[PDB]
Amino acid sequence: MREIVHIQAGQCGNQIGAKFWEVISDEHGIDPTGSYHGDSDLQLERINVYYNEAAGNKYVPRAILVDLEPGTMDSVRSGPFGQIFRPDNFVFGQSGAGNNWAKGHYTEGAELVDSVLDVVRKESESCDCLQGFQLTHSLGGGTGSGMGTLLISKIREEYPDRIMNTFSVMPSPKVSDTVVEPYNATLSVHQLVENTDETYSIDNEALYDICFRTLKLTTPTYGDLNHLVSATMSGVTTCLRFPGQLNADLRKLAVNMVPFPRLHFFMPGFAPLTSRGSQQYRALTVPELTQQMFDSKNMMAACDPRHGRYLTVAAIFRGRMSMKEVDEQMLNVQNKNSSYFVEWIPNNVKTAVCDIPPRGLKMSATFIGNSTAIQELFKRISEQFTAMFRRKAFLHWYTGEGMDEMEFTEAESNMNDLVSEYQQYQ
């Protein structure tokens, strides 16, 4: 019933994807070996929505790990939950892309894309009725942006009616661990803007910004950053994994958040985000959570929403709570801040709640926002691309794989178009 096919592309996509199966396995109460040791019967009610049944009451995940570097799979396979994945799903190349979009899209990806399409076809026909695709990648690099965006195009050709969901991390100028980020970035959004129906814009610097102020971790690693973004992946698919008073499927989130076919780049958020040294000094009631959800500094994107206007926003709550306090908080949050909300839509908020909260927390929610402040990211990314493209810097490596410079200009044409599209509705 409404299965979701997971596909982990790129290095970062495998990390957050590995953490995604980790955090939800504790919710469903699945051992790392694959056997069930939970407590609730509702965990088995919708275990098939992500997993597949097998002999001995073992549940293998419907994960397809793809990467052009075999060392990444060795770290994921040797992890805590690395043994639960299927060995057949671990398809991979031998030579890395080396942070080149042309290599992972034309030459290095084309030899492997024939091998992955037969694998995802197995997981697609084996299910009862597939709903969509939950993909994880990074706009930087070559294997994430090149090969990850390639199979988005092929899956659009084969399954044009299904939902194409993407949890994509993207670069920024303050934190940049790669020189070829704007070239890889502008080439990836050309495919995401046309093919995919929904995308979550996650900025890496905001993952560090949120851990200083609210969580105040003194020694944060990448695993801590994967924990908070993977919680958002669990929040979006909570309504169909457990029952609730007001269920909202991933398609039900799409129609409320995607007012136009190109304006589907969202801005995720999550709460409660509180340190252990300040957990006792906080009330779990919803008004203290609602002010944290719509906070300018709480979200995992560096774009300040006060510099623009929200097109449409969704909040999927979790846990047993009172609906009047939930619904009335959505009223005062938007009318008091009417300047930060478009007047040509009467109600920008979408509500949803579930009866089964995460383990260890009684009250929680996930913030999903499509705002016009995201064009600031497209502004700085476009200027970094135009600054390096205007003298043809770092393009001769791309031409070696048969790539034309006009495609960079066509990607540049798409960049200012979607920038001007967000500027139309502000």
Place this chain on the structure above:
Amino acid sequence: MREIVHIQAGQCGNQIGAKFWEVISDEHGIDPTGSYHGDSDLQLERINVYYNEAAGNKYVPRAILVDLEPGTMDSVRSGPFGQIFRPDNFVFGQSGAGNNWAKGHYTEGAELVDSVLDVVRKESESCDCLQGFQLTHSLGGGTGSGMGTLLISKIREEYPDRIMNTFSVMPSPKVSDTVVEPYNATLSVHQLVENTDETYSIDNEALYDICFRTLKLTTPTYGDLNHLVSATMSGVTTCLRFPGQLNADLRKLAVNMVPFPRLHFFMPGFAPLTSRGSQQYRALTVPELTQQMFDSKNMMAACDPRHGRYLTVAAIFRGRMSMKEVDEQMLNVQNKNSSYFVEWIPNNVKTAVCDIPPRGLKMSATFIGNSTAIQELFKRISEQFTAMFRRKAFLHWYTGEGMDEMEFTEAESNMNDLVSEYQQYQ
């Protein structure tokens, strides 16, 4: 009741034939010494269909090992199940054929063929009612293709009404352990196409191709290759060795698979083929088995079926299972892939099931397919024969035994005819 006379010709035929008696002896629960130590009473219900009763509750197999090289019988006799065979059946020459079809067919075979006809006549008249002949040989070499195909002609003269079944391995250009393969190949198919009613086309490179992908053996030997092909020999004769809900005899398989008298070259397959490191991550239900049966890469022939159209296919299942899931899987597998199935036949699939699966497995099946993709093997084999025949290369050795070059041309005339016959129905 419907006895089958086994006859192991050639080196490879003795190996897979020795493995054939090995794998079925565990199914019937027969000791290597010859005494019964099984558990089920149905094993004795149809033990006479292959074995003969003797004193002391000992069961000798109805195997006739023929070879022109005495060293081969010493390895088979000194094997695990080498002592169960009859010593009188071990008839053999002294001088090998040396990979020459003319030697094993005219001179070296003619001196021994008088000795083997009196032996098979003993096993034929000793039975209650013989059904057919289960022969194993190789199209390469001289003793397998020359002497093995010779007694097919003599048995056709004596028993024209009985079924002539052959499990024949054949060469390929990628893996070729002999120089005289296309000459021996094209001379053997001249006899198999006219005399035999049914033949299984097994390609040696596909035996290696299947062990990399699905079974992933790191150190495979010839004994591992004999295990998977011998399972297919057990699958074809399962319906008369044990009871079932829908029994299909070897003659019942022939009429469904042999639409014309010459088009009887089949393409075997078997499932489940899963490694020990991926057995727990697989479901034994029939839809995961059905997609593996009709898979392009699962079969033991290198001809890709997607480049042609299936003339007719049969699947003999094994084990207690539900018929609705079995029958409905045959519906969606053919209609979704209507391009790979002929439109001038409404239903190409033949169904069969048994209640007694193999030991150690609860669900299994064997794939039997007559497809027009097999002409690709006849194409490359014909071009290798025509490439060497057009200047009379390696023919002077054949003329020493009194063989005429016109017979090579007559064999060449048969080659393009059966090639064009498969091209007629595509």
Place this chain on the structure above:
Amino acid sequence: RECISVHVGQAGVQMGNACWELYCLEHGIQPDGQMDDSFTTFFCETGAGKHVPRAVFVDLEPTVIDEIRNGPYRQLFHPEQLITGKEDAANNYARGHYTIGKEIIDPVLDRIRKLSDQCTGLQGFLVFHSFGGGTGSGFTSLLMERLSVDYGKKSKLEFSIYPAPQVSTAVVEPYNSILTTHTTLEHSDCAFMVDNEAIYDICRRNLDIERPTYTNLNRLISQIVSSITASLRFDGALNVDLTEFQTNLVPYPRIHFPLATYAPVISAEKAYHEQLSVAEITNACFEPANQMVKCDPRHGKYMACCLLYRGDVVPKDVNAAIAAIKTKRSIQFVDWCPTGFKVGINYQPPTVVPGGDLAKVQRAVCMLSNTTAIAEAWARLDHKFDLMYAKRAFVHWYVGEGMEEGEFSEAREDMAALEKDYEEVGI
């Protein structure tokens, strides 16, 4: 994933003897030839309980080869892989390329072919030499030209030791460097560089070694070339490969000259008194006198910069450190690459040699960065070459080998083409 290497000349084998002793003690490989997927990149599995490096030390003069055979590390290297010539190159580009070069490449070129066939994940090549000599100039350009026409697509990580501005070991090293760079300018994908007096300045100030030797110089060089390939050997939080050095550092195919530096360089007694974190060492590698080349980065502009860390370095304080470098106006980046930063991290920490000059540190960094600052060095090398070329100094030895005056003009104008490209790209 695997990689092979060939060492040429006295400069190569001295670094070859110094780097492979570092690689063996990292993976617990004793010097007698024996002690999972960490050593498979460089070392092979020789049947059972025995290893062999993927190394071929080639040299025309036989003093270095048999010394390695009679050295302490006898059983590690293969006895056949240690190739030796018959007659020295004798500080001549032509002699190691045509007379002695042509008659020895045939044993060498077919060896790297079959030595690569047993491998399957050959990522590229890395060489070790010095253009100040003959065998390091002539024979190196010959083999690198002979394999580039065969493979081509694979990478080539050149490690050449250039002469200092005022310090120098030879007298004809401009002739040796100017001729071999004419062939290296088009075939080499990238080429990291090392200097003579600069690396002496590292151990003089920070390591306080007032009487060092080449044995001490090659140790910290081994730390550099082992740290760049440490990502493929051991697991890391952000794994990088050898192909990253081509995409992130080479903006144009004929401008392929990054710099090289390393930090922290600190002695034993000074290690315990000095604080170890990413902030202080991030400022140390960008310090101009802490580089391995006498060149002022303030004069030029960094085209691209790459960083690779080791040890317990979390991604928080390392990102705050480089952010302070962006707002620091002591150095200036070029407008053609604003986001010219490539960060890397490996979990395995920097090791230490028993009895070595360097001390044990819980973290380290090595920076490779392309810049327009090295144009003045090519102007300096081209300037001094015109003084000797005007008098036709040391020319009769090269033409006695088989060359003429014409290709000297090609070597001059090809470097002149590089200067106009460096001032154009530096706008």
Place this chain on the structure above:
Amino acid sequence: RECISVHVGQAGVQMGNACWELYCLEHGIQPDGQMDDSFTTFFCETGAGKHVPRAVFVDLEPTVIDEIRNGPYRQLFHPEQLITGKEDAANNYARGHYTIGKEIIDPVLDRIRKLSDQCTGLQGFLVFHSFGGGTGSGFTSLLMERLSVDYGKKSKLEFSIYPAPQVSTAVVEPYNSILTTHTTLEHSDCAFMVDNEAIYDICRRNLDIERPTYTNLNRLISQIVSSITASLRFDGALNVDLTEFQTNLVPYPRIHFPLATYAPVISAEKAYHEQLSVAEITNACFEPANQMVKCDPRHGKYMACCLLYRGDVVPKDVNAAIAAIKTKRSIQFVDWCPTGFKVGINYQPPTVVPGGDLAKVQRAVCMLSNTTAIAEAWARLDHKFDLMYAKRAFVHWYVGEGMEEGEFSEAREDMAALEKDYEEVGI
């Protein structure tokens, strides 16, 4: 299954003394004459607890025969089987064929008859000689002609040592080789060949024996001729017989000249450092300088190729190795035989002699392949023969024996017929 052998000349008995010591230590046969179906092919059962080889060492000069009688291996060989003559052939084809040959074949020919009658599974014959001498040229053609008219149908595995291109032991060896090949061209089914300086090149480069002798040369030759017959002795996964060498290698009855090579050749100290698998040795035997004949296979085209392995070699990695040889364009196969590969495997591994030059290896390979590359050697031998034939050099000794000038013309034109066949079949 059994087979008999006869050794002729100094070249034969030196290989005879070297090969039968290898056969005895394989089957645990001590040199005193004593220690199931493994030794029955070559050695007989002499009543109880005693064996005798199926060997007859024939030679006209008596120095080699009595040395074997007074050698260490006295009790193994029969005292009557060691036949000795009265007068040496003296490097003359005619003298060992007519004067001394006719008076000694009668003891020899009837011996192999009754020595075969006690046998029952005689597969064929294999001889050992060298056409560079007199007894190896004249007497060998006489006996091989005398048994071919009697048996005919049985195989004949000739093992002749041809002279090198520039190295040579005699001066009249073109006259000796050109006359005996006139009779061998039609009666011999197949003939493997060995060279003098080529086998020296094997032990010089790979085995690093700078001062070898003929005792060392015959050891690796014994490994070759013992490995081809290892399939009939011990059990194998793919058993091959002596008749396979006639069908798979002889495309035409008058083109019956395969090459010979062996791998791996490696010393003791080098065996432990070098990796042992099928991939590296499959490339070693196809290496042109690793052959037992100074001949370039790149010039010609392989008509057919046969492979025979020993030891623990699974059929997976050996099939992947030869598949890499097919796509490798360094060598080119002829269009008249695309699938020119005959693979074989035996479970019994390669042994090692106590105190021998070769080291113990867990696997081995020996390749016998027909090719058109050997036409230039016949052109070389025919070319130098015309220089001496034009001056009538060394002719008065042959006509003094009983011959004339006519059959010299037949020997010339018969080899001239072979060259036009080699250039025609090589199209």
